[PDB]
Amino acid sequence: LLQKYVTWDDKSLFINGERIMIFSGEFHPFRLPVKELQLDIFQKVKALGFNCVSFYVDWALVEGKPGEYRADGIFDLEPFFDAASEAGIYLLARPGPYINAESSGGGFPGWLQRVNGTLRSSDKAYLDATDNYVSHVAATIAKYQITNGGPIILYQPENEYTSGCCGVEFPDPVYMQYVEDQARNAGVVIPLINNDASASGNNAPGTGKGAVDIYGHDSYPLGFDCANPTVWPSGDLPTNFRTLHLEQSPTTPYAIVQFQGGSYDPWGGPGFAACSELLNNEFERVFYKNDFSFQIAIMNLYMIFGGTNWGNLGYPNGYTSYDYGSAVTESRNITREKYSELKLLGNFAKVSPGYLTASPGNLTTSGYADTTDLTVTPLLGNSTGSFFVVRHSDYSSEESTSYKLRLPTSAGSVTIPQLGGTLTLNGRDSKIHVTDYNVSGTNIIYSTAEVFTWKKFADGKVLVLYGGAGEHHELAISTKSNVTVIEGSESGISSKQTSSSVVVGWDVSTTRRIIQVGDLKILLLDRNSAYNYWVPQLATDGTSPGFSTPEKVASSIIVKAGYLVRTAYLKGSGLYLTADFNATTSVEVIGVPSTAKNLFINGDKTSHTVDKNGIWSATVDYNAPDISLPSLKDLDWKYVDTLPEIQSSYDDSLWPAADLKQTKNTLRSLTTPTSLYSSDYGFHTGYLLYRGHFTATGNESTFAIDTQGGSAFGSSVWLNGTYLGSWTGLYANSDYNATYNLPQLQAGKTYVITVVIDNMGLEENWTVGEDLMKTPRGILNFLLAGRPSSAISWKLTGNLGGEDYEDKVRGPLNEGGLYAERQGFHQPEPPSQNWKSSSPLEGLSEAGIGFYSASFDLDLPKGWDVPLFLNIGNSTTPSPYRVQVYVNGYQYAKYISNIGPQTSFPVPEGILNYRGTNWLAVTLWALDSAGGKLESLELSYTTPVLTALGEVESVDQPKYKKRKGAYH
């Protein structure tokens, strides 16, 4: 339409004139702000057989100050894009402005609470507020389009523009057209794709103004309830998705822009390990092959890698972790079985172009298989091949089911298995059987066992097939040649020859078999052996694999290894692999080019033997060195009181006054004399403090207050130095009405109520019209009994400078309003040399907030990827306390003792310096009159990985420097 690099028809996208199945994974650059680890994720995604990544940009992080767009350093998108290019990974860009994404404000900066107009509408006040952001971020995206040699192939304007309310004319075509035009005006020429929250047809081609180029929708069919991970409720497997696609957008490829790849988890919830159990390998093979049943051509898993809600970037209902139960864990490991299972399907689709050209039919409980207990959806191709997706009719069934099939082929319609026995489907599993499947000229008439991959080498073809344990399988090949078993035993290998074919039957075994039929070798594996196979692209012009183009796809090799294979390249007589290892691993290479004489692994020449079938074998030894980690409790901890506000000497005269008589928040009108909404004064993140001055009459009894900080928030209140009490918090409370009883006050004297409130982040804005992101934070109501409310004059603070935020390197959200934070003491090398010697393990003996500082050295060995975790103990029911931990200035843990569930906090290399000094800054807020302390505090590690990754550069860690604008 506007360029010729990326086109489409009713079946699929074309990239440079060639069909491709887009298999993508969601990865957010702002949730992993170390550029070398971004590359790691991209390489792990490519090893799945994927070819794309989808990403959000968080507006709140890059325009904290209205009018000042900053996407530099750790927020720089350019290294993220170059890393995609280096890995051979295309990109779907989704910069919002609204992104939801369990992020504070759903991506909107806190200053949108002052916008006089409906958010996500055509009100000019909202649209003008978006202009500066979109023109900058879309210009950067434009520069890296595929039209300009970049990796970016698709662009998503808005996010799930699907439901409206409250007087909004939904859907508004003027709005979506303006959003679309903003991108085009910034120079975006690539196709636009939307993500309708459900398959409702919004903004599809044919809808007139505001229509996108490719209609996409989203789907999370198993819900977000990770508490019952084995429960698959009745009817939750979609069946009508193709039907709705043809009704809603028959001219564009079938696209799910966010398909479930995990789940979010709230404060107090069951934990992300439970989420990984619900969205496990069984879920993937049943539900993802079900999407293939609808001939899905663009498929994106939200999330493929989740990362971390560091520096308060997350929304109020969620906590520090965003592991998401995804295929790649928060700490970047790929141990979960769901990673290996998904690799099998990604590789299937990477080499099966016949899938895109078949004619999908309707699902059947009869006609293909001999039992109504199975459902079979056919995708019928002519000479291009056919595909049959088999599953249990009741998709939740754990029953083992025997069956036979009738499949049409070029050689007649066959009743399979021909040579005796039956096929089996065990429990929550799904198969894609193939017919007339083309292996570069050799035609597989049929195979019941699923295809992992196939390649054409200089000296013959290889095909890799697998089945699950206990299964009997069958294939047939168009050939005059006979079948011979070249690896393994003939026992269990039955066969029959005809004039134009050979039929072969086999039982799945833990022992591999290789059979040979003319110039085709076929590997017959079990699913668990296949989990250890990889298909890196073989580079000849350099060391990078390049994008997944037909030519580079065809020039790939097959490697059996362990934990991970990243890349392969050929250079003279040298075949080079880059790979990672979590144990001593035997490596086999199939498809070694004839010009290759030596094997290098991670640059190191490695001995190899060649067996009778031309397969190179080698061994990679794993010997972790001593991983020495200091004891956190033995460090030289230094303490300073970070609530000096509750001493009578404190002088708040430099504090902003909360003296606005009219709020700019259109959602909730004032129920107090002045606005006590933090965002009216430019304070959107972290702990908020309010100070209320009054002159006592001496008749004061009680002080009531309604605090609001979002779900799981807490608040504490003092009268001068007297602790009045705390709201200790519940996930179910986003506000709370306390009543406090005051001591006997001295008539004519001045008092100050100090109030501390945990701001858990700003709310999302999912429903257009509702403006829920404007939900304020701070104090909503108060009553000083017997006195008019004008008796109290308030001041407040958030992070120092508010929207004129101090830390331009770490961004607008990282730090909140505590004294120690205002002064910048949470950064490396604070002025702690004259502080008191006290540990957070000793803690506090009265309600308050303390700040603890210490450094520690690491000297971890080069060439190892070692995930490190901070651990805060909770072996027994604790008293109510709140903890924030800054690692070299970066906040990487928020902890609520009484709500949970997170006790283990990963912190990535780059934020941590593995061969240098590191700084911990811990805040400890005790919401109890007897104080509080940490039970324990420990640095731990999980399995070290022998890695190919390059040196991880430390991000910028600005050290403490005295701040002019502070209040002291």
Ligand X SMILES: *[C@@H]1O[C@H](CO)[C@@H](O[C@@H]2O[C@H](CO)[C@@H](O[C@@H]3O[C@H](CO)[C@@H](O)[C@H](O[C@H]4O[C@H](CO)[C@@H](O)[C@H](O)[C@@H]4O[C@H]4O[C@H](CO)[C@@H](O)[C@H](O)[C@@H]4O[C@H]4O[C@H](CO)[C@@H](O)[C@H](O)[C@@H]4O)[C@@H]3O)[C@H](O)[C@H]2NC(C)=O)[C@H](O)[C@H]1NC(C)=O
Ligand Y SMILES: OC[C@H]1O[C@@H](OC[C@H]2O[C@@H](O)[C@H](O)[C@@H](O)[C@H]2O)[C@H](O)[C@@H](O)[C@H]1O
Ligand Z SMILES: *[C@@H]1O[C@H](CO)[C@@H](O[C@@H]2O[C@H](CO)[C@@H](O[C@@H]3O[C@H](CO[C@H]4O[C@H](CO)[C@@H](O)[C@H](O[C@H]5O[C@H](CO)[C@@H](O)[C@H](O)[C@@H]5O)[C@@H]4O)[C@@H](O)[C@H](O[C@H]4O[C@H](CO)[C@@H](O)[C@H](O)[C@@H]4O[C@H]4O[C@H](CO)[C@@H](O)[C@H](O)[C@@H]4O[C@H]4O[C@H](CO)[C@@H](O)[C@H](O)[C@@H]4O)[C@@H]3O)[C@H](O)[C@H]2NC(C)=O)[C@H](O)[C@H]1NC(C)=O
Ligand U SMILES: *[C@@H]1O[C@H](CO)[C@@H](O[C@@H]2O[C@H](CO)[C@@H](O[C@@H]3O[C@H](CO[C@H]4O[C@H](CO[C@H]5O[C@H](CO)[C@@H](O)[C@H](O)[C@@H]5O[C@H]5O[C@H](CO)[C@@H](O)[C@H](O)[C@@H]5O)[C@@H](O)[C@H](O[C@H]5O[C@H](CO)[C@@H](O)[C@H](O)[C@@H]5O)[C@@H]4O)[C@@H](O)[C@H](O[C@H]4O[C@H](CO)[C@@H](O)[C@H](O)[C@@H]4O[C@H]4O[C@H](CO)[C@@H](O)[C@H](O)[C@@H]4O[C@H]4O[C@H](CO)[C@@H](O)[C@H](O)[C@@H]4O)[C@@H]3O)[C@H](O)[C@H]2NC(C)=O)[C@H](O)[C@H]1NC(C)=O
Ligand V SMILES: *[C@@H]1O[C@H](CO)[C@@H](O)[C@H](O)[C@H]1NC(C)=O
Q: What is the contact surface with ligand Y in residues (CB under 6 A)?
A: 100-102, 160, 197-198, 218-220, 258, 264, 302
Output Rg (C-alpha) for the chain, integer angstroms.
30
Question: SS3 for 33-93, per residue?
Answer: CCHHHHHHHHHHHHCCCCCEEEEECCHHHHCCECCECCCCHHHCHHHHHHHHHHHCCEEEE
Alpha-carbon gap, residue 465 to 855, rounded angstroms: 53
Taking residue 649's Cβ as centre, other Cβ atoms within 10 Å add up to: 5
Rounded to 10 deg, the angle between the 77-87 and 35-46 helix axes is: 30
Tell me the sheet residues that pair with 855: 919
**Residue 281 interacting with ligand U (CB under 6 A):** yes
Q: Which tokens sit at 281?
A: 């390998």
Q: Quick one: which segment of 301-309, 457-465, 722-730, 750-758 binds ligand V (CB under 6 A)? A: 750-758
Written as six digits, the tokens of 332 are 């970047």
> Could you say whether residue 822 binds Cl ion (CB under 5 A)?
yes
Classify residue 412 as exposed, middle or buried by CB count within 10 Å of its CB (0-12, 13-18, 19+).
exposed
Q: Give the β-pairing of 848-857 and 917-926.
A: antiparallel
Query: Is residue 781 a contact point for ligand Z (CB under 6 A)?
Result: no
160 vs 758, which CB is nearer to ligand Y?
A: 160
100 or 281, CB closer to ligand X?
Answer: 100
* 904 sits near ligand Z (criterion: CB under 6 A): yes
**Between 190 and 934, CB nearer to ligand Z:** 934
With a CB cutoff of 8 Å and minimum separation 6, the contacts of 533 are 452, 453, 464, 558, 559, 560
Contact 904, 914 (CB under 8 A): no
Alpha carbon separation from 701 to 691, 742, 747 (Å, rounded): 19, 6, 13
Distance between start and end Cα atoms, the chain: 60
To ligand Y, the closest distance from the beta carbon of 823 in angstroms equals: 36
- Per CB under 5 A, the segment of 304-312, 431-439, 445-453, 821-829 that binds Cl ion is 821-829
The reply on whether position 440 binds ligand V by CB under 6 A is yes
Cβ-based nearer residue to ligand Z, 378 or 867? 867
> Distance between CA 688 and CA 758 in Å, rounded?
7
Q: Which does 586 bind (CB under 5 to 8 A by kind): ligand U, ligand V, ligand Y, none?
A: none
How many chain residues touch ligand V (CB under 6 A)? 24
User: Is the preceding omega at residue 901 within 30 degrees of 0, hence cis?
Assistant: yes
Q: Which of 203, 293, 333, 442 binds ligand Z (CB under 6 A)?
A: 333
SS3 238: coil
Q: Which does 264 bind (CB under 5 to 8 A by kind): ligand U, ligand X, ligand Y, none?
A: ligand Y
Site string for ligand U, 240-279 (x = CB under 6 A): ------------------------------------xx--
630 sits near ligand Z (criterion: CB under 6 A): no
Question: For ligand U, which residue has the nearest CB?
Answer: 280
Beta carbon of residue 881, minimum distance to ligand Z (angstroms, whole number): 17
From 57-65, 590-598, 775-783, 816-824, span contacting Cl ion (CB under 5 A): 816-824
* Choice between 150 and 692, CB closer to ligand V: 692
Site for ligand Z contains 606 (CB under 6 A): no
Is the CB of 528 or the CB of 838 nearer to ligand U? 528
User: Judged by CB under 6 A, which stretch of 359-367, 434-442, 515-523, 848-856 contacts ligand V?
Assistant: 434-442
337, interface contact from ligand Z, ligand X, ligand U, none, CB < 5-8 Å by kind: ligand U
Among 936, 953, 965, 968, binds ligand Z (CB under 6 A): 936
- The H or E element that residue 354 is part of is helix 354-357
Q: Contacting ligand Z (CB under 6 A), which of 234, 573, 875, 877?
A: 875
d(CA 360, CA 357): 9
For position 273 contacting Cl ion by CB under 5 A, the verdict is: no
Of 218, 220, 216, nearest to 249 (Cα)? 216
Provide the token pair at 409: 């082929």
As a 3-state breakdown, the chain gives helix, strand, coil percent values, each rounded to 5, of 15, 35, 50
Q: Amino acid identity of 771?
A: D
DSSP 8-state assignment for residue 227: T
Closest approach, Cβ 399 to ligand U, in A, equals 13
The one segment of 95-103, 274-282, 789-797, 893-901 that binds ligand X by CB under 6 A: 893-901
Is the peptide bond between 221 and the residue preceding it cis, with omega within 30 degrees of 0?
no
230 binds ligand Z (CB under 6 A): no
Does residue number 458 form part of the binding site for ligand X (CB under 6 A)?
no
- Per rule CB under 6 A, is residue 942 in the interface with ligand Z? yes
Site for ligand Z contains 938 (CB under 6 A): yes
For the CB of residue 315, give the shortest distance to ligand Y in the complex, in Å: 9
- Is-contact 779 706, C-beta < 8 A? yes
The size of the interface with ligand X (CB under 6 A), counted in residues, is 18
Is residue 268 a contact residue for ligand X (CB under 6 A)?
yes
- Amino acid letter, residue 614: G
Candidates 393-401, 591-599, 873-881, 907-915 — which segment interacts with ligand X by CB under 6 A? 873-881
Residue in this structure with the two tokens 């668990």, named with its chain if needed? 528
385 burial type by CB count under 10 A (0-12 exposed, 13-18 middle, 19+ buried): buried
Partner in contact with 277, chosen from ligand U, ligand X, ligand V, none, beta carbon below 5 to 8 Å by kind:
ligand U
**Site residues for ligand Z, window 308-327 (CB under 6 A)?**
323
The residue behind tokens 């008589």 is 661
Q: Please report which helix (H) or strand (E) contains residue 444, including its range.
A: strand 442-447
Nearer to ligand X, 519 or 938 (CB): 938
Q: Token pair 């490190």 is at which residue?
A: 868
Question: Do residues 65 and 812 touch, judged by C-beta distance below 8 A?
Answer: yes
Among residues 542, 390, 535, 519, the alpha carbon closest in space to that of 467 is found at: 390
Nearer Cβ to Cl ion (798/944): 798
Half-sphere exposure of 535 (CA within 13 A, CB side): 30
Q: How far is the CB of 19 from ligand Z (least distance, A)?
A: 36
Find the binder of ligand X among 393, 549, 617, 874 (CB under 6 A).
874
- What mask of x and - would describe binding to ligand X in positions 225 to 264, judged by CB under 6 A? --x-------------------------------------
User: Both tokens of residue 825?
Assistant: 């003491």
Q: Write each residue from 683 to 712 as x if it is in contact with ligand V (CB under 6 A), else as -, in one continuous string.
A: ----------------x-x----x------
Q: Which does 386 bind (CB under 5 to 8 A by kind): ligand V, ligand Y, ligand U, none?
A: none
What residue ranges bind ligand U (CB under 6 A)? 276-277, 280-282, 335-337, 340, 426, 429, 468-469, 510, 528, 531-532, 562-563, 582-583, 943
What residue ranges bind ligand V (CB under 6 A)? 116, 383-384, 438, 440-441, 648, 650, 664, 666, 699, 701, 706, 720, 733, 735-737, 746, 749-752, 781
